[PDB]
Amino acid sequence: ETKKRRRI
Amino acid sequence: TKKRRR
Amino acid sequence: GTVNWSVEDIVKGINSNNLESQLQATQAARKLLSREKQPPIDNIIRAGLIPKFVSFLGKTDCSPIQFESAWALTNIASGTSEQTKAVVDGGAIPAFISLLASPHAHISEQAVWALGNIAGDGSAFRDLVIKHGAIDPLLALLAVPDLSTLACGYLRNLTWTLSNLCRNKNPAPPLDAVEQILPTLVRLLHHNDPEVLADSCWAISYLTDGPNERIEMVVKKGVVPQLVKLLGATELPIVTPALRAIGNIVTGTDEQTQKVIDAGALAVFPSLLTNPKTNIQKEATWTMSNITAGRQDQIQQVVNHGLVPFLVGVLSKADFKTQKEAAWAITNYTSGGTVEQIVYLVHCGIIEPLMNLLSAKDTKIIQVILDAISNIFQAAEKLGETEKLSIMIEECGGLDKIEALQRHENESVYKASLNLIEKYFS
């Protein structure tokens, strides 16, 4: 899956 | 056990 | 215009004694950190800004700066472990947990996301978020009669963060925390949003990746039938985690494996073993190998569902890593199967594709294939048909490959091949 996510 | 894991 | 400020300008405003000047500079920072092209995370850290942002989180009287600092810190924590550590070292964790109680949903949503990035770093920060007490207020945000009244994106962020609290090993998450979270996961697994469902499955896949006691916690909640249902979804982002969880579960006891069979899983494997995504095929075959390593009545269910031909197929043609897992599946089958079952396997055409894999450049697969042959010859002895089998292996190019392997580096290889030659080809 996606460890960590940035808000764009 | 013949079962293998990840 | 809070677009394109310099880090110098941002510092000048955050250091002013003016709440509105500080708010404008903080929004300038947020905008820097949310651009798609190389955000300047390290520059912001080196400027000393994290403690200021953390302090802004508590300005209950000025919710806009609460939001902007929350967003800015979220994106710093999205970075490397060193960058996430900088946010944690600033005191952010208790501050973000306080913000979960904000009356403004867009602010509490941002605190959920931030805590997700921090827990996502790994075991230690995950356990630190749990020690600061995040789990109670997170679950309280989902305590509503019907999840559909919540905003889609809000529920998606909650589910994602919950999956990160279940994630990682060495160590796995605390057992008490897993007990607290599982009921809610079960509920989210029945929600109709594909994204909620994928992250819910990932979460279950993390929890089932351990000792039989962990598996049992999950299986006791009754989710295996719902997992098998999602195994049949059309969305590959749901199937992938659901298959991983089912496969983890069948590394367990035979009693846990049986619940997966009873739930209908085997009926979905014809498609999974022919799936166009390589990793689906690989994971479906590994799962099959752990099922052919079970009881004989379980091998028999594999037979009844018509899956032996599909294993022959994967052995014959598939990515090499999938073929390797298929070989394991055969060795387990031949090792624990009855004579009748091994006969059937041969009648389905296993010998030729088994032989063709002996010219592979992987030492381990050759060991696996030789064990399987040996096992089959043992069943032929019991039927006194060792000659028919010898002829079969001879007729398809097999004896050449086995004889050539006698003069091979590895020891188990030359020992096992030389034994077969002496014993059945003399």
Author numbering:
A (entry chain C): 1491 to 1498
B (entry chain M): 1492 to 1497
C (entry chain E): 72 to 497
Quote the study on this structure.
The final IMPα:NLS model contained IMPα (residues 72–497), with HaHV1 NLS (residues 1491ETKKRRRI1498) bound in both the major (ARM repeats 2–4) and minor (ARM repeats 7–8) sites of IMPα. Structural characterization of the interface revealed that HaHV1 UL36h binds to the IMPα major site with a canonical monopartite NLS, and a well-characterized lysine at the P2 site. The protein complex was analyzed using PDBePISA and the interface at the minor site comprises an interface of 608.2 Å 2 mediated by six hydrogen bonds and seven salt bridges, whilst the major site comprises an interface of 779.4 Å 2 and is mediated by fourteen hydrogen bonds and two salt bridges. Within the IMP⍺ major site, HaHV1-NLS Glu1491 interacts with IMP⍺2 Ser234 and forms a salt bridge with Arg238. HaHV1-NLS Lys1494 binds IMP⍺2 residues Asp192, Gly150 and Thr155, forming a salt bridge with Asp192. HaHV1-NLS Arg1495 forms two hydrogen bonds with each IMP⍺ Asn188 and Asn228, and HaHV1-NLS Arg1496 forms two hydrogen bonds with Arg106 and one hydrogen bond with Leu104. Finally, HaHV1-NLS Arg1497 binds IMP⍺2 by forming hydrogen bonds with Asn146 and Gln181. We also observed a secondary binding of the HaHV1-NLS at the minor site of IMPα; however, this is likely an artefact due to the high concentration of peptide required for crystallization, and similar to what has been observed and described previously for other monopartite NLSs, such as the SV40 LTA NLS bound to mouse and yeast IMPαs and other NLSs.
In other herpesviruses, the large tegument protein UL36 plays a crucial role in transporting the viral capsid to the host cell’s nuclear pore complex (NPC), mediated by N-terminal nuclear localization signals (NLSs). In this process, one of the seven known isoforms of importin α (IMPα) recognizes and binds to cargo proteins containing a classical nuclear localization signal (cNLS). Structurally, the central region of IMPα contains 10 tandem Armadillo (Arm) repeat motifs, each approximately 42–43 amino acids in length and predominantly composed of hydrophobic residues. The major site, spanning Arm repeats 2 to 4, accommodates residues designated P1 to P5 of the cNLS, while the minor site, located within Arm repeats 6 to 8, binds positions P1′ to P4′.
